[PDB]
């Protein structure tokens, strides 16, 4: 129908042009030509307000650059590959703290000297993501070895020895799994298996285990997705067990959708849309001012985090992907409508048409709380990945309406 | 440029949809689910009129499929993947006649038996492109080995021992080089070098050599491109020596553009444009009925080939790519206009706006000469490739002009 088609073409045009714009911001402001890597502590105008290198964002930016370079012809330029390679080098040299050991630092000084180390696998995950993409664009085996080796390091750490990360558990701390873990691991499994039967086959068992774990966070007879649950998949008590993050449930949701799409498993896909897309959104959406809450408490109690009611950029970018994907997958037009809802709200609320890129932090009412375009937790990732994926999905959708 | 970004969007939309259409044709009619491989002998309606498998086109199709699969998201579907793999397996099992040796048959029976062997390298050339592409989408090393091993064999055949190709030398035969050899060689060099720093550097010199040979076909002080020249890059006599093909000149032209795209030589770029684009078009375009002549004689003598005046699909598909790429590399409007001129003519004359895909043979008047959509020399290549590239090229142009 013309109605549908025109709206999609419009949106595909909107996100595509936006990607060009947000990418332009990172291309002209975040490149550290003197030491390699990127500056993410960028002000509203792109001015660097700090020269620290947050490992997460470096890995993410490298992956993003490569990803675009090989998927979107308009991004197949040397500037991207040069920056991406210079980024991988930086990671290759300084990412690791004591660099036999694979444990990576959370943040490094501009020159690559470790400043902080986080007892998690997050820096490492993005490290392996950037490594694998660099290999995809240069075919240099050293990148894939770095990637696969780190991957196996992470698997071991997560499934066989939490020790390699530190923080021996106190007899009082409850053994709880954070959703981010299976999600990230699953993300990796998907990243590596992409166009690689060997790797896809190698981590098949892990991919399943990961999806299964993520599903274990669906609690209260399928009425709540809980950020944390016991290692055995049971609801925890206290603020810890009641903690919710809608933005995260949606992201896990689309990660799961991606995992099952190939599995032509409409059963799983259905359940995921219900419990990971609609439920979180319905609970998370702020009826009074629009936008998804950052945090929530399953029992409806006031969250403990000061910033729970803030509207952050990534839960929305992830909502856009998850809905467009769910629709692309089930054709259920309700999801298309939700995508439109989320997409209009975030495009209207987070974009900064003055300088480029998007603000990442708004107060509950949707007003800009922080003017920074990048920082300790915001880089060239969530936004550009969301725009790229939507652009792709739309392109594919308008190909069946034509 | 609003006055221009319009037709461009128009064309990008037209080529993308057309590509969807032509691809749909091949996907639904060409697959051989019994012995693998594709049927290229299809009538105007997709009906098979012969089950012979022409190695050239078999390799071209497996190449096309994979290329689309990984570069255009909407084609990133199982159908294309499984089909290309079956095509590749088919090629792996029968392309080679004496399957110790590397010589590939020219035509095989539906089940893979050699029917005829062309004393050339073309079959092997496309086998190479198909295997390399199969590597890029499965990461299966066996495919890459097959590719590189063949590439090396081909190089030997044209640079060291052409005798392996067979074809006895005769005292009256003049030693000559046909532009198609350095052309196919350069095409393979660009192909293998894609996102592969190793192979890129490894064949870098050969790349430079081919380009040089090709350029050696420009004669009469840049006033003519000759299909055949002596090994010494000198004009031969007779019909052979004056033989021209505006389609290959234009093809060579963009091959060179892509190649020297890294170099950046504006002097060479201007040259290739002038002699491989404007020249072949200026003298090969049918003023009376529009369209590029198939063959022409450098001396303006009536060709000896019966079909010399026939308007074929691939000279035009190659012209669209060339002009568009030239405008992209030089920004000269004169070239953009020529793209429109060619694009308009080929879309209007070759498209079969009832069954899909294009007719490949029209009489000089532009009327359909043959109604086949595929045959001994027409497969899933020149059209989908031309469309896909123009799409990508228009996307990049629109993004920087917007």
PDB file of N, CA and C in Angstrom, chain A residues 130-207:
ATOM      1  N   UNK A 130      36.073  -5.575  18.049  1.00  0.00           N
ATOM      2  CA  UNK A 130      36.861  -4.714  17.188  1.00  0.00           C
ATOM      3  C   UNK A 130      37.891  -5.526  16.421  1.00  0.00           C
ATOM      4  N   UNK A 131      38.480  -6.515  17.090  1.00  0.00           N
ATOM      5  CA  UNK A 131      39.492  -7.375  16.483  1.00  0.00           C
ATOM      6  C   UNK A 131      38.946  -8.142  15.285  1.00  0.00           C
ATOM      7  N   UNK A 132      37.803  -8.782  15.492  1.00  0.00           N
ATOM      8  CA  UNK A 132      37.138  -9.562  14.468  1.00  0.00           C
ATOM      9  C   UNK A 132      36.729  -8.723  13.257  1.00  0.00           C
ATOM     10  N   UNK A 133      36.325  -7.477  13.481  1.00  0.00           N
ATOM     11  CA  UNK A 133      35.921  -6.623  12.375  1.00  0.00           C
ATOM     12  C   UNK A 133      37.141  -6.160  11.603  1.00  0.00           C
ATOM     13  N   UNK A 134      38.233  -5.902  12.317  1.00  0.00           N
ATOM     14  CA  UNK A 134      39.452  -5.458  11.655  1.00  0.00           C
ATOM     15  C   UNK A 134      39.904  -6.569  10.725  1.00  0.00           C
ATOM     16  N   UNK A 135      39.761  -7.806  11.185  1.00  0.00           N
ATOM     17  CA  UNK A 135      40.154  -8.954  10.379  1.00  0.00           C
ATOM     18  C   UNK A 135      39.268  -9.037   9.142  1.00  0.00           C
ATOM     19  N   UNK A 136      37.985  -8.749   9.310  1.00  0.00           N
ATOM     20  CA  UNK A 136      37.084  -8.805   8.176  1.00  0.00           C
ATOM     21  C   UNK A 136      37.440  -7.778   7.094  1.00  0.00           C
ATOM     22  N   UNK A 137      38.071  -6.664   7.467  1.00  0.00           N
ATOM     23  CA  UNK A 137      38.430  -5.643   6.469  1.00  0.00           C
ATOM     24  C   UNK A 137      39.878  -5.617   5.989  1.00  0.00           C
ATOM     25  N   UNK A 138      40.716  -6.493   6.525  1.00  0.00           N
ATOM     26  CA  UNK A 138      42.111  -6.517   6.110  1.00  0.00           C
ATOM     27  C   UNK A 138      42.549  -7.939   5.856  1.00  0.00           C
ATOM     28  N   UNK A 139      41.779  -8.882   6.382  1.00  0.00           N
ATOM     29  CA  UNK A 139      42.060 -10.302   6.243  1.00  0.00           C
ATOM     30  C   UNK A 139      43.337 -10.730   6.983  1.00  0.00           C
ATOM     31  N   UNK A 140      43.906  -9.838   7.799  1.00  0.00           N
ATOM     32  CA  UNK A 140      45.124 -10.168   8.553  1.00  0.00           C
ATOM     33  C   UNK A 140      44.753 -11.146   9.676  1.00  0.00           C
ATOM     34  N   UNK A 141      45.318 -12.348   9.632  1.00  0.00           N
ATOM     35  CA  UNK A 141      45.036 -13.371  10.633  1.00  0.00           C
ATOM     36  C   UNK A 141      45.315 -12.973  12.071  1.00  0.00           C
ATOM     37  N   UNK A 142      46.296 -12.107  12.278  1.00  0.00           N
ATOM     38  CA  UNK A 142      46.618 -11.693  13.629  1.00  0.00           C
ATOM     39  C   UNK A 142      45.426 -11.040  14.338  1.00  0.00           C
ATOM     40  N   UNK A 143      44.511 -10.453  13.569  1.00  0.00           N
ATOM     41  CA  UNK A 143      43.348  -9.814  14.170  1.00  0.00           C
ATOM     42  C   UNK A 143      42.358 -10.868  14.624  1.00  0.00           C
ATOM     43  N   UNK A 144      42.175 -11.888  13.800  1.00  0.00           N
ATOM     44  CA  UNK A 144      41.246 -12.950  14.144  1.00  0.00           C
ATOM     45  C   UNK A 144      41.765 -13.809  15.294  1.00  0.00           C
ATOM     46  N   UNK A 145      43.079 -13.996  15.357  1.00  0.00           N
ATOM     47  CA  UNK A 145      43.654 -14.800  16.431  1.00  0.00           C
ATOM     48  C   UNK A 145      43.416 -14.027  17.718  1.00  0.00           C
ATOM     49  N   UNK A 146      43.680 -12.722  17.676  1.00  0.00           N
ATOM     50  CA  UNK A 146      43.484 -11.875  18.849  1.00  0.00           C
ATOM     51  C   UNK A 146      42.027 -12.007  19.281  1.00  0.00           C
ATOM     52  N   UNK A 147      41.124 -11.932  18.310  1.00  0.00           N
ATOM     53  CA  UNK A 147      39.695 -12.036  18.572  1.00  0.00           C
ATOM     54  C   UNK A 147      39.233 -13.377  19.142  1.00  0.00           C
ATOM     55  N   UNK A 148      39.587 -14.462  18.469  1.00  0.00           N
ATOM     56  CA  UNK A 148      39.195 -15.783  18.927  1.00  0.00           C
ATOM     57  C   UNK A 148      39.818 -16.108  20.281  1.00  0.00           C
ATOM     58  N   UNK A 149      41.079 -15.731  20.450  1.00  0.00           N
ATOM     59  CA  UNK A 149      41.772 -15.996  21.698  1.00  0.00           C
ATOM     60  C   UNK A 149      41.106 -15.262  22.857  1.00  0.00           C
ATOM     61  N   UNK A 150      40.735 -14.002  22.642  1.00  0.00           N
ATOM     62  CA  UNK A 150      40.088 -13.235  23.690  1.00  0.00           C
ATOM     63  C   UNK A 150      38.719 -13.843  23.958  1.00  0.00           C
ATOM     64  N   UNK A 151      38.052 -14.249  22.889  1.00  0.00           N
ATOM     65  CA  UNK A 151      36.741 -14.849  23.013  1.00  0.00           C
ATOM     66  C   UNK A 151      36.786 -16.047  23.950  1.00  0.00           C
ATOM     67  N   UNK A 152      37.735 -16.945  23.718  1.00  0.00           N
ATOM     68  CA  UNK A 152      37.854 -18.130  24.557  1.00  0.00           C
ATOM     69  C   UNK A 152      38.254 -17.762  25.980  1.00  0.00           C
ATOM     70  N   UNK A 153      38.958 -16.645  26.120  1.00  0.00           N
ATOM     71  CA  UNK A 153      39.383 -16.186  27.432  1.00  0.00           C
ATOM     72  C   UNK A 153      38.088 -15.844  28.159  1.00  0.00           C
ATOM     73  N   UNK A 154      37.261 -15.030  27.517  1.00  0.00           N
ATOM     74  CA  UNK A 154      35.991 -14.619  28.095  1.00  0.00           C
ATOM     75  C   UNK A 154      35.091 -15.793  28.457  1.00  0.00           C
ATOM     76  N   UNK A 155      34.953 -16.757  27.551  1.00  0.00           N
ATOM     77  CA  UNK A 155      34.110 -17.913  27.823  1.00  0.00           C
ATOM     78  C   UNK A 155      34.585 -18.574  29.108  1.00  0.00           C
ATOM     79  N   UNK A 156      35.877 -18.871  29.175  1.00  0.00           N
ATOM     80  CA  UNK A 156      36.438 -19.505  30.358  1.00  0.00           C
ATOM     81  C   UNK A 156      36.085 -18.718  31.617  1.00  0.00           C
ATOM     82  N   UNK A 157      36.373 -17.420  31.594  1.00  0.00           N
ATOM     83  CA  UNK A 157      36.097 -16.538  32.726  1.00  0.00           C
ATOM     84  C   UNK A 157      34.659 -16.577  33.206  1.00  0.00           C
ATOM     85  N   UNK A 158      33.741 -16.594  32.253  1.00  0.00           N
ATOM     86  CA  UNK A 158      32.322 -16.617  32.540  1.00  0.00           C
ATOM     87  C   UNK A 158      31.756 -17.957  32.953  1.00  0.00           C
ATOM     88  N   UNK A 159      32.201 -19.019  32.293  1.00  0.00           N
ATOM     89  CA  UNK A 159      31.717 -20.364  32.589  1.00  0.00           C
ATOM     90  C   UNK A 159      32.606 -21.279  33.390  1.00  0.00           C
ATOM     91  N   UNK A 160      33.842 -20.877  33.669  1.00  0.00           N
ATOM     92  CA  UNK A 160      34.728 -21.752  34.435  1.00  0.00           C
ATOM     93  C   UNK A 160      35.593 -21.131  35.526  1.00  0.00           C
ATOM     94  N   UNK A 161      35.868 -19.839  35.434  1.00  0.00           N
ATOM     95  CA  UNK A 161      36.695 -19.206  36.452  1.00  0.00           C
ATOM     96  C   UNK A 161      36.462 -17.717  36.565  1.00  0.00           C
ATOM     97  N   UNK A 162      35.445 -17.318  37.341  1.00  0.00           N
ATOM     98  CA  UNK A 162      35.241 -15.892  37.636  1.00  0.00           C
ATOM     99  C   UNK A 162      36.482 -15.218  38.236  1.00  0.00           C
ATOM    100  N   UNK A 163      37.362 -16.033  38.823  1.00  0.00           N
ATOM    101  CA  UNK A 163      38.598 -15.562  39.452  1.00  0.00           C
ATOM    102  C   UNK A 163      39.462 -14.656  38.586  1.00  0.00           C
ATOM    103  N   UNK A 164      39.663 -15.048  37.329  1.00  0.00           N
ATOM    104  CA  UNK A 164      40.473 -14.256  36.415  1.00  0.00           C
ATOM    105  C   UNK A 164      40.047 -12.801  36.304  1.00  0.00           C
ATOM    106  N   UNK A 165      38.942 -12.459  36.967  1.00  0.00           N
ATOM    107  CA  UNK A 165      38.419 -11.094  36.951  1.00  0.00           C
ATOM    108  C   UNK A 165      38.593 -10.450  38.327  1.00  0.00           C
ATOM    109  N   UNK A 166      38.843 -11.284  39.335  1.00  0.00           N
ATOM    110  CA  UNK A 166      39.026 -10.782  40.685  1.00  0.00           C
ATOM    111  C   UNK A 166      37.727 -10.797  41.468  1.00  0.00           C
ATOM    112  N   UNK A 167      37.690 -10.036  42.564  1.00  0.00           N
ATOM    113  CA  UNK A 167      36.509  -9.940  43.429  1.00  0.00           C
ATOM    114  C   UNK A 167      35.975 -11.285  43.954  1.00  0.00           C
ATOM    115  N   UNK A 168      36.856 -12.135  44.531  1.00  0.00           N
ATOM    116  CA  UNK A 168      36.353 -13.209  45.402  1.00  0.00           C
ATOM    117  C   UNK A 168      35.112 -12.794  46.206  1.00  0.00           C
ATOM    118  N   UNK A 169      34.034 -13.552  46.028  1.00  0.00           N
ATOM    119  CA  UNK A 169      32.777 -13.290  46.709  1.00  0.00           C
ATOM    120  C   UNK A 169      32.829 -13.396  48.228  1.00  0.00           C
ATOM    121  N   UNK A 170      32.234 -12.402  48.882  1.00  0.00           N
ATOM    122  CA  UNK A 170      32.170 -12.337  50.338  1.00  0.00           C
ATOM    123  C   UNK A 170      31.036 -13.287  50.738  1.00  0.00           C
ATOM    124  N   UNK A 171      31.107 -13.878  51.939  1.00  0.00           N
ATOM    125  CA  UNK A 171      30.090 -14.878  52.281  1.00  0.00           C
ATOM    126  C   UNK A 171      28.674 -14.297  52.311  1.00  0.00           C
ATOM    127  N   UNK A 172      28.572 -12.978  52.166  1.00  0.00           N
ATOM    128  CA  UNK A 172      27.273 -12.328  52.187  1.00  0.00           C
ATOM    129  C   UNK A 172      26.670 -11.987  50.835  1.00  0.00           C
ATOM    130  N   UNK A 173      27.521 -11.762  49.837  1.00  0.00           N
ATOM    131  CA  UNK A 173      27.063 -11.428  48.497  1.00  0.00           C
ATOM    132  C   UNK A 173      26.369 -12.628  47.874  1.00  0.00           C
ATOM    133  N   UNK A 174      25.174 -12.403  47.331  1.00  0.00           N
ATOM    134  CA  UNK A 174      24.387 -13.461  46.691  1.00  0.00           C
ATOM    135  C   UNK A 174      24.895 -13.672  45.268  1.00  0.00           C
ATOM    136  N   UNK A 175      25.073 -14.932  44.879  1.00  0.00           N
ATOM    137  CA  UNK A 175      25.551 -15.243  43.536  1.00  0.00           C
ATOM    138  C   UNK A 175      24.442 -14.860  42.567  1.00  0.00           C
ATOM    139  N   UNK A 176      24.633 -13.772  41.842  1.00  0.00           N
ATOM    140  CA  UNK A 176      23.613 -13.352  40.911  1.00  0.00           C
ATOM    141  C   UNK A 176      24.159 -13.082  39.520  1.00  0.00           C
ATOM    142  N   UNK A 177      23.400 -13.462  38.498  1.00  0.00           N
ATOM    143  CA  UNK A 177      23.834 -13.235  37.126  1.00  0.00           C
ATOM    144  C   UNK A 177      23.224 -11.931  36.624  1.00  0.00           C
ATOM    145  N   UNK A 178      24.051 -11.117  35.985  1.00  0.00           N
ATOM    146  CA  UNK A 178      23.602  -9.844  35.452  1.00  0.00           C
ATOM    147  C   UNK A 178      23.246 -10.165  34.013  1.00  0.00           C
ATOM    148  N   UNK A 179      22.118  -9.660  33.538  1.00  0.00           N
ATOM    149  CA  UNK A 179      21.721  -9.944  32.165  1.00  0.00           C
ATOM    150  C   UNK A 179      22.769  -9.568  31.124  1.00  0.00           C
ATOM    151  N   UNK A 180      23.460  -8.453  31.354  1.00  0.00           N
ATOM    152  CA  UNK A 180      24.488  -7.975  30.439  1.00  0.00           C
ATOM    153  C   UNK A 180      25.490  -9.045  30.018  1.00  0.00           C
ATOM    154  N   UNK A 181      25.785  -9.976  30.915  1.00  0.00           N
ATOM    155  CA  UNK A 181      26.737 -11.031  30.603  1.00  0.00           C
ATOM    156  C   UNK A 181      26.313 -11.957  29.457  1.00  0.00           C
ATOM    157  N   UNK A 182      25.213 -12.727  29.612  1.00  0.00           N
ATOM    158  CA  UNK A 182      24.770 -13.552  28.476  1.00  0.00           C
ATOM    159  C   UNK A 182      24.565 -12.737  27.195  1.00  0.00           C
ATOM    160  N   UNK A 183      23.985 -11.559  27.348  1.00  0.00           N
ATOM    161  CA  UNK A 183      23.732 -10.693  26.216  1.00  0.00           C
ATOM    162  C   UNK A 183      24.999 -10.417  25.438  1.00  0.00           C
ATOM    163  N   UNK A 184      26.002  -9.910  26.140  1.00  0.00           N
ATOM    164  CA  UNK A 184      27.273  -9.592  25.513  1.00  0.00           C
ATOM    165  C   UNK A 184      27.915 -10.811  24.881  1.00  0.00           C
ATOM    166  N   UNK A 185      27.875 -11.934  25.586  1.00  0.00           N
ATOM    167  CA  UNK A 185      28.454 -13.159  25.066  1.00  0.00           C
ATOM    168  C   UNK A 185      27.706 -13.562  23.799  1.00  0.00           C
ATOM    169  N   UNK A 186      26.383 -13.474  23.841  1.00  0.00           N
ATOM    170  CA  UNK A 186      25.585 -13.837  22.681  1.00  0.00           C
ATOM    171  C   UNK A 186      25.926 -12.917  21.528  1.00  0.00           C
ATOM    172  N   UNK A 187      26.142 -11.653  21.854  1.00  0.00           N
ATOM    173  CA  UNK A 187      26.480 -10.666  20.848  1.00  0.00           C
ATOM    174  C   UNK A 187      27.746 -11.125  20.149  1.00  0.00           C
ATOM    175  N   UNK A 188      28.712 -11.575  20.945  1.00  0.00           N
ATOM    176  CA  UNK A 188      29.986 -12.052  20.421  1.00  0.00           C
ATOM    177  C   UNK A 188      29.770 -13.264  19.530  1.00  0.00           C
ATOM    178  N   UNK A 189      29.009 -14.223  20.029  1.00  0.00           N
ATOM    179  CA  UNK A 189      28.747 -15.414  19.252  1.00  0.00           C
ATOM    180  C   UNK A 189      28.221 -15.008  17.877  1.00  0.00           C
ATOM    181  N   UNK A 190      27.265 -14.084  17.856  1.00  0.00           N
ATOM    182  CA  UNK A 190      26.698 -13.632  16.596  1.00  0.00           C
ATOM    183  C   UNK A 190      27.749 -12.938  15.734  1.00  0.00           C
ATOM    184  N   UNK A 191      28.533 -12.059  16.345  1.00  0.00           N
ATOM    185  CA  UNK A 191      29.573 -11.331  15.620  1.00  0.00           C
ATOM    186  C   UNK A 191      30.539 -12.274  14.896  1.00  0.00           C
ATOM    187  N   UNK A 192      31.088 -13.233  15.636  1.00  0.00           N
ATOM    188  CA  UNK A 192      32.037 -14.211  15.100  1.00  0.00           C
ATOM    189  C   UNK A 192      31.482 -15.187  14.071  1.00  0.00           C
ATOM    190  N   UNK A 193      30.285 -15.702  14.321  1.00  0.00           N
ATOM    191  CA  UNK A 193      29.697 -16.641  13.389  1.00  0.00           C
ATOM    192  C   UNK A 193      29.308 -16.030  12.061  1.00  0.00           C
ATOM    193  N   UNK A 194      29.169 -14.713  12.035  1.00  0.00           N
ATOM    194  CA  UNK A 194      28.795 -14.018  10.811  1.00  0.00           C
ATOM    195  C   UNK A 194      29.673 -14.427   9.638  1.00  0.00           C
ATOM    196  N   UNK A 195      29.064 -15.001   8.605  1.00  0.00           N
ATOM    197  CA  UNK A 195      29.804 -15.430   7.414  1.00  0.00           C
ATOM    198  C   UNK A 195      31.033 -16.246   7.757  1.00  0.00           C
ATOM    199  N   UNK A 196      30.923 -17.087   8.763  1.00  0.00           N
ATOM    200  CA  UNK A 196      32.055 -17.901   9.148  1.00  0.00           C
ATOM    201  C   UNK A 196      31.465 -19.165   9.709  1.00  0.00           C
ATOM    202  N   UNK A 197      31.275 -20.164   8.858  1.00  0.00           N
ATOM    203  CA  UNK A 197      30.697 -21.409   9.322  1.00  0.00           C
ATOM    204  C   UNK A 197      31.479 -22.054  10.425  1.00  0.00           C
ATOM    205  N   UNK A 198      32.795 -22.011  10.315  1.00  0.00           N
ATOM    206  CA  UNK A 198      33.618 -22.615  11.340  1.00  0.00           C
ATOM    207  C   UNK A 198      33.303 -22.034  12.720  1.00  0.00           C
ATOM    208  N   UNK A 199      33.445 -20.721  12.855  1.00  0.00           N
ATOM    209  CA  UNK A 199      33.182 -20.058  14.123  1.00  0.00           C
ATOM    210  C   UNK A 199      31.736 -20.213  14.554  1.00  0.00           C
ATOM    211  N   UNK A 200      30.833 -20.098  13.591  1.00  0.00           N
ATOM    212  CA  UNK A 200      29.415 -20.232  13.866  1.00  0.00           C
ATOM    213  C   UNK A 200      29.225 -21.615  14.481  1.00  0.00           C
ATOM    214  N   UNK A 201      29.861 -22.611  13.875  1.00  0.00           N
ATOM    215  CA  UNK A 201      29.741 -23.957  14.379  1.00  0.00           C
ATOM    216  C   UNK A 201      30.436 -24.121  15.704  1.00  0.00           C
ATOM    217  N   UNK A 202      31.591 -23.478  15.844  1.00  0.00           N
ATOM    218  CA  UNK A 202      32.373 -23.560  17.077  1.00  0.00           C
ATOM    219  C   UNK A 202      31.645 -23.058  18.315  1.00  0.00           C
ATOM    220  N   UNK A 203      30.914 -21.957  18.175  1.00  0.00           N
ATOM    221  CA  UNK A 203      30.195 -21.401  19.309  1.00  0.00           C
ATOM    222  C   UNK A 203      28.702 -21.644  19.352  1.00  0.00           C
ATOM    223  N   UNK A 204      28.230 -22.622  18.589  1.00  0.00           N
ATOM    224  CA  UNK A 204      26.810 -22.930  18.562  1.00  0.00           C
ATOM    225  C   UNK A 204      26.315 -23.247  19.958  1.00  0.00           C
ATOM    226  N   UNK A 205      27.013 -24.143  20.649  1.00  0.00           N
ATOM    227  CA  UNK A 205      26.613 -24.518  22.002  1.00  0.00           C
ATOM    228  C   UNK A 205      26.561 -23.312  22.938  1.00  0.00           C
ATOM    229  N   UNK A 206      27.515 -22.398  22.783  1.00  0.00           N
ATOM    230  CA  UNK A 206      27.549 -21.216  23.628  1.00  0.00           C
ATOM    231  C   UNK A 206      26.390 -20.282  23.298  1.00  0.00           C
ATOM    232  N   UNK A 207      26.112 -20.119  22.010  1.00  0.00           N
ATOM    233  CA  UNK A 207      25.027 -19.252  21.594  1.00  0.00           C
ATOM    234  C   UNK A 207      23.708 -19.684  22.199  1.00  0.00           C
TER     235      UNK A 207
END
